[PDB]
């Protein structure tokens, strides 16, 4: 069992570099449009106190330097959708995959293709936290990197990167330019709401541990859904819904462990700690695997 | 800091499926050769005690079904090199990257592109353990999946998947078909040697902690390489080689902490534990980040 990402080839073929004067970041080239974070139009001074509509009307198409590898792409139009800039270019991307733009729900997972200067660098799996941050690995020049899922040859783009919070977690938008969470694309220190643990994902991960032979945390107790949620909320875990219980069905069916029985194990874990033992080699309870992630990897 | 796979697109364009009879696995299509595990030519029953030489003499070019997607690549030549089959096909792969075949050392990390029926399924980072297994994630149909590194748009292929041990770890070959470790490609339960901790990678991780301002564990002592190697073995840690000392060079230079000073700090952690303290947010010492991974990810 590993943290596994989608193969990144279909997205790699779409990454380009976008530059305005001194400011450079990544864009996503689909058909004849390049999508990128709108703050590419900002100078350093602009970023402190931007008026985006004001700065954009003053830009000309020839101010935008778009590079796909060695080839420059001529910008022939531009518009702004929330925090995303849409650059019309004179060439269609011949490797545009079947794709969709989706806004994901907290607790869902996606793969991140970290890019720098339009060049793909690494791929890794992230979850949208309940407080709408993501725990990513992003350096200077990573803005415009995207997150995505792949479902039978179709790429669902869900995340475009904009920001690293003082706490080292990250914040960004969907491909409609709308931030996840209460953040803004301005050069200021911003805090997120208090984070919580994604309970349904922890449970999926415990089932993964059982599937892979580690059972030490199981017990003979059970619990009602409500009494589990009482303890979970006490430890800053998200509540578990009956929808979540149903989504855990296949993993319950596979292991022969009723969902509310695994809840009783998790309750004991939260109240007792792991006593220095590990689960799937982790000293901490892991909450960035969805039930579908576990089902896909373990079957 | 977290584990990152390489972007997999250059390798995805090289994945094909190879079928003999009803037996299908994955192959790697570079120029006009497809590389794949030789046990594709086994029936379910021959895998118990296979005579690959005798099994291959019954085989002809036209018995091999090679497909890129649903498109057949006609096989025009075949040969066996150790545990891989090399199938020459009539079409040179137009997406062949710059590539090399390399045999990695224990401790080295690489990205694995897990594939099923020639269809890439996922990508993740792996380290070769000192006992020559990898802690992978593989299901039925995964054989022929490859592991690789990318250095300046050149793909270094280092692993082709063959086997899952009873303990749930994985074993395979380099792309010349030579197993890492004492494993053989037959349908038998095989055991790996007892595993050890990858000392050079733990040290790289301590340097990354230092680079990030987490340096409480730096002590006032130094050690000789030989003294350290002897104590490290008492804790089931790998001994350091001269090559290990040299690849820690850049990180030592960046932090101003001599390699042997860091070894003395690690030795104190081994003899005394962490005393409830963490390093880079972990109570456990991480050993699957190489010095290159620390440089790359910073
Ligand atoms: C993009 O590369 C920018 O084009 C960059 C990515 C981050 C740099 C380091 N790691 C990253 O993920 N983004 C930024 O620099 C953004 C730009 C905004 C949206 C205009 N800003 C921040 O991430 C940012 C600003 C501040 C800050 O101010 C003052 C104070 C504290 C944190 C902080 N983060
Ligand atoms: C390839 O897919 C096979 O072409 C398959 C991959 C493993 C299946 C489950 N997870 C995997 O990684 N490989 C095998 O089935 C190989 C085939 C050999 C090389 C001919 N065999 C094993 O991995 C294997 C056999 C046995 C065994 O016997 C009896 C007993 C215990 C473990 C075991 N593993």
């Amino acid at each position: 069992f590993r943290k596994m990402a989608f193969p990144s080839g279909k997205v790699e073929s779409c990454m380009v570099q976008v530059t305005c004067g001194t400011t450079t970041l990544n864009g996503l080239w689909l058909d004849d449009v390049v999508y990128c974070p709108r703050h590419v139009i900002c100078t350093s001074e602009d970023m402190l106190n931007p008026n985006y509509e004001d700065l954009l009307i003053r830009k000309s198409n020839h101010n935008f330097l778009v590079q796909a590898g060695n080839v420059q792409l001529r910008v022939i139009g531009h518009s702004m959708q929330n925090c995303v800039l849409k650059l019309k270019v004179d060439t269609a991307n011949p490797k545009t995959p079947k794709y969709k733009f989706v806004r994901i729900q907290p607790g869902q997972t996606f793969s991140v293709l970290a890019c720098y200067n339009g060049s793909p660098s690494g791929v890794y799996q992230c979850a949208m936290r309940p407080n709408f941050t993501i725990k990513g690995s992003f350096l200077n020049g990573s803005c415009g990197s995207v997150g995505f899922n792949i479902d039978y040859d179709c790429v669902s783009f869900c995340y475009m990167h904009h920001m690293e919070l003082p706490t080292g977690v990250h914040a960004g938008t969907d491909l409609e330019g709308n931030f996840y969470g209460p953040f803004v694309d301005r050069q200021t220190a911003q805090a997120a709401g208090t984070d919580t643990t994604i309970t349904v994902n922890v449970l999926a991960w415990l089932y993964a541990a059982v599937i892979n032979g580690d059972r030490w945390f199981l017990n003979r107790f059970t619990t009602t859904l409500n009494d589990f949620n009482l303890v979970a909320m006490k430890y800053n875990y998200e509540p578990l819904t009956q929808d979540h219980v149903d989504i855990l069905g296949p993993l319950s069916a596979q292991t022969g462990i009723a969902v509310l029985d695994m809840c009783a194990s998790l309750k004991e874990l939260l109240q007792n700690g792991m006593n220095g033992r590990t689960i799937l080699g982790s000293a901490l309870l892991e909450d960035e695997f969805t039930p579908f992630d576990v089902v896909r990897q373990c079957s």
Side-chain angles (χ1 to χ4, degrees), chain A residues 256-266 269-274 276 278-283 285-294:
Chain A
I257 307 166
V259 178
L260 290 173
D261 282 355
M262 190 70 80
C263 283
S265 300
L266 179 48
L269 255 357
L270 293 181
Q271 300 177 340
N272 297 343
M274 281 167 70
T278 75
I279 294 172
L280 289 171
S282 160
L285 301 184
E286 173 70 47
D287 75 337
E288 298 210 347
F289 293 94
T290 73
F292 172 77
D293 295 348
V294 171

Side-chain angles (χ1 to χ4, degrees), chain A residues 7 15-17 26 29 38 42 75 79 92 115 131 148-149 201 245 286 294:
Chain A
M15 299 313 300
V16 305
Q17 183 175 16
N26 308 282
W29 183 23
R38 66 179 173 178
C42 293
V75 174
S79 62
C115 299
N131 76 354
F148 61 94
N149 284 276
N201 287 4
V245 171
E286 173 70 47
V294 171

Side-chain angles (χ1 to χ4, degrees), chain A residues 33-44 46-47 50-66 68-69 71 73 75-87 89-97 99 101-108:
Chain A
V33 187
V34 167
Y35 305 76
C36 71
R38 66 179 173 178
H39 68 260
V40 66
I41 70 181
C42 293
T43 79
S44 100
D46 294 341
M47 287 179 185
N51 192 304
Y52 279 108
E53 296 279 4
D54 222 39
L55 302 178
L56 183 52
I57 194 92
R58 306 175 177 154
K59 294 277 306 189
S60 310
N61 286 351
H62 64 87
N63 293 129
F64 295 100
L65 161 62
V66 180
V71 196
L73 276 36
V75 174
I76 55 158
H78 68 260
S79 62
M80 179 164 75
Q81 184 180 5
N82 303 305
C83 305
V84 153
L85 182 56
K86 275 139 71 176
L87 298 183
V89 287
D90 66 352
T91 307
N93 183 1
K95 293 183 205 284
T96 310
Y99 76 93
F101 292 166
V102 308
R103 190 168 170 95
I104 47 157
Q105 316 277 326
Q108 288 193 280

Side-chain angles (χ1 to χ4, degrees), chain A residues 8-44 46-47 50-66 68-69 71 73 75-87 89-97 99 101-134 136-151 154-219 222-242 244-266 269-270:
Chain A
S8 58
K10 296 178 162 48
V11 184
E12 292 170 49
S13 300
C14 300
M15 299 313 300
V16 305
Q17 183 175 16
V18 181
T19 308
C20 282
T22 204
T23 298
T24 188
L25 42 66
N26 308 282
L28 181 73
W29 183 23
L30 305 159
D31 293 319
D32 62 340
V33 187
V34 167
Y35 305 76
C36 71
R38 66 179 173 178
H39 68 260
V40 66
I41 70 181
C42 293
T43 79
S44 100
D46 294 341
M47 287 179 185
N51 192 304
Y52 279 108
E53 296 279 4
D54 222 39
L55 302 178
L56 183 52
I57 194 92
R58 306 175 177 154
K59 294 277 306 189
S60 310
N61 286 351
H62 64 87
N63 293 129
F64 295 100
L65 161 62
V66 180
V71 196
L73 276 36
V75 174
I76 55 158
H78 68 260
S79 62
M80 179 164 75
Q81 184 180 5
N82 303 305
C83 305
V84 153
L85 182 56
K86 275 139 71 176
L87 298 183
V89 287
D90 66 352
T91 307
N93 183 1
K95 293 183 205 284
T96 310
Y99 76 93
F101 292 166
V102 308
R103 190 168 170 95
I104 47 157
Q105 316 277 326
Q108 288 193 280
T109 52
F110 56 100
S111 302
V112 167
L113 180 67
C115 299
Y116 298 88
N117 310 291
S119 283
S121 171
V123 62
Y124 58 88
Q125 188 90 327
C126 281
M128 182 55 69
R129 309 291 318 158
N131 76 354
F132 292 106
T133 65
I134 73 169
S137 312
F138 288 119
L139 301 179
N140 282 349
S142 55
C143 283
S145 298
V146 301
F148 61 94
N149 284 276
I150 304 183
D151 304 293
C154 180
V155 187
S156 292
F157 292 106
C158 58
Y159 178 85
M160 180 170 269
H161 182 53
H162 292 241
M163 168 156 300
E164 183 168 307
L165 304 190
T167 56
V169 307
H170 300 97
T173 66
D174 60 24
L175 271 292
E176 295 192 332
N178 288 310
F179 262 94
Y180 295 97
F183 312 106
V184 294
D185 50 339
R186 161 174 281 241
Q187 194 82 171
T188 67
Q190 306 168 47
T194 65
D195 206 14
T196 46
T197 306
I198 310 162
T199 306
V200 61
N201 287 4
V202 173
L203 285 166
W205 179 74
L206 291 175
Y207 277 116
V210 165
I211 292 185
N212 288 276
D214 213 339
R215 297 174 65 102
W216 70 259
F217 48 84
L218 297 179
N219 59 55
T222 199
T223 174
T224 63
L225 180 54
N226 181 77
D227 288 341
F228 171 78
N229 279 333
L230 281 176
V231 175
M233 288 184 287
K234 182 190 189 193
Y235 287 87
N236 249 315
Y237 277 48
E238 297 279 289
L240 196 70
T241 66
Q242 186 61 55
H244 294 152
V245 171
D246 297 335
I247 298 152
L248 284 163
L251 294 173
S252 182
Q254 174 169 353
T255 55
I257 307 166
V259 178
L260 290 173
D261 282 355
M262 190 70 80
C263 283
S265 300
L266 179 48
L269 255 357
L270 293 181

